[PDB]
């Protein structure tokens, strides 16, 4: 029963502790050192303008109430004490619907150093909205943000900061790329302030730069569309006496242009403006129709 010393230490720490007041309430500003480690960048749902990402959202601050003197210098703890002590109420500004994985136990981690420093990490899957400008589809690129900050605590009370150099804070795993359409080029952190009716709040933004891969859209739309324009074009080598062959070739051509057009348009999200693929389909179809009407007047 050597654990009696440690349970005495923990009971002493929680005796009179108030987890409802931030540390240093009437003395200073609470400084929260935040970190993110992307275990896997989830697929980007283009249809909903969102993207998925799995992170070990790591934080650290300093509570002077939780100092201790014991044989061991770091208390690694069962993660249910995080409910028993103050933690900052960080929330994702653009988070749509995120889940903290509770399998098997709560995927949470709490460490208390001798000096009173805390290290509260959590695993979770963020689902954040990425507003896209699909004018250059499928040659487009996006900077999908990830903005987070404290709810209900202003800039004068809870200020967020990066734990390491900002270039080296948000780290992505090597094989952690579940993407299949896009590719991940780089990360971009930024720290800023947002003004609101209730006051000022610190906001840390992370942008992930993405470039869409053209390889599948070359095969699906552009190559069939070029071949179909050529299929219009070989009508003109056909003669003027065999009118039924040329007219059926033309009407079949505009038929396959129509079905290719709606097939291409079903893939994209519905948008209120014309994209590059849409312009390509429209121009190439205009060439198909121009070939048909030139055959007609011939």
């Amino acid at each position: 029963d050597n654990t009696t010393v440690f349970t005495r230490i923990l009971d002493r720490l929680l005796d009179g502790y108030d987890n409802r007041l931030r540390p240093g309430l009437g003395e200073r500003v609470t400084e929260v050192k935040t970190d993110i480690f992307v275990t896997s960048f989830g697929p980007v749902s283009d249809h909903d303008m969102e993207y998925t990402i799995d992170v070990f959202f790591r934080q650290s601050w300093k509570d002077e109430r939780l100092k201790f003197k014991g044989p061991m210098t770091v208390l690694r703890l069962n993660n249910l004490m995080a409910s028993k002590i103050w933690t900052p109420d960080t929330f994702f500004h653009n988070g749509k619907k995120s889940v903290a994985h509770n399998m098997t136990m709560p995927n949470k981690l709490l460490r208390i150093t001798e000096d009173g420093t805390l290290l509260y990490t959590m695993r979770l899957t963020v689902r954040a909205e990425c507003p896209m400008h699909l004018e250059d589809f499928p040659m487009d690129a996006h900077a999908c943000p990830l903005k987070f900050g404290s709810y209900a605590y202003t800039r004068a009370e809870v200020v967020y900061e990066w734990t390491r150099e900002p270039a080296r804070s948000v780290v992505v795993a090597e094989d952690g790329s579940r993407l299949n359409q896009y590719d991940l080029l780089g990360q971009t952190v930024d720290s800023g302030i947002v003004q609101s009716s209730t006051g000022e709040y610190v906001v840390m933004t992370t942008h992930f730069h993405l470039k869409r891969k053209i390889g599948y859209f070359v095969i699906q739309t552009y190559l069939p569309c070029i071949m179909t324009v050529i299929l219009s074009q070989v009508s003109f080598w056909l003669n003027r006496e065999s009118v039924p062959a040329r007219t059926v070739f033309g009407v079949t051509t505009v038929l396959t242009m129509t079905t290719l057009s709606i097939s291409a348009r079903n893939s994209l999200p519905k948008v209120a403006y014309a994209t590059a693929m849409d312009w390509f389909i429209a121009v190439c179809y205009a060439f198909v129709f121009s070939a048909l009407i030139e055959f007609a007047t011939v």
Partner: antibody
Amino acid sequence: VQLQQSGAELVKPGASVKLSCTASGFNIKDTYMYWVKQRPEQGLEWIGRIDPANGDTKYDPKFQGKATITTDTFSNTAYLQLSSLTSEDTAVYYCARKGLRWAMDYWGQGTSVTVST
Amino acid sequence: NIVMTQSPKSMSMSVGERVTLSCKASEYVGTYVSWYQQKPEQSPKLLIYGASNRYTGVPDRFTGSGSATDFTLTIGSVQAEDLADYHCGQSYSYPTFGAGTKLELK
């Protein structure tokens, strides 16, 4: 709150020199410590940085090997030691800590290393 | 290694007029460009933490502009104590400084 350093030093070339930077009014483990040199009428040049809480250290790719940074968690002291020096690195060496937005808010007093015969 | 290009290398101006400085970043740095004043035979003193945020104790005449790479420090009515060496330095990556800017009265 305030960073004090050692006084100016006069050393011969090819020797080794050790600078001190003691902190008062706070504890070094909660913030990074930086070492910056400024030549006489040239701009600032960053040497390296030490994490006192962990002991991890990083160096400029033109100061690797030459300069080494160490810390003493008792004295709230940051130590800069340089191995071998030529007849160009006679400059004021500043000690500073990270501030609010990763800015060097508090700096030392400056220690001018001098070289002659 | 991010390199900071600061302009102009020296200047001269009269009391009580607008003066604007410039610091340019080779790579991206979000808002982590800090400006430091250094009077002759004095340690550097921080003015502007990050991009466009005044430090404690600084007067209200000083102010800076923030962007991805282009950073400018502007001063309004200039008093006679501003003769000093002003440096810009980033902190998005491992910290680096520019050449500096030297202010003179004439």
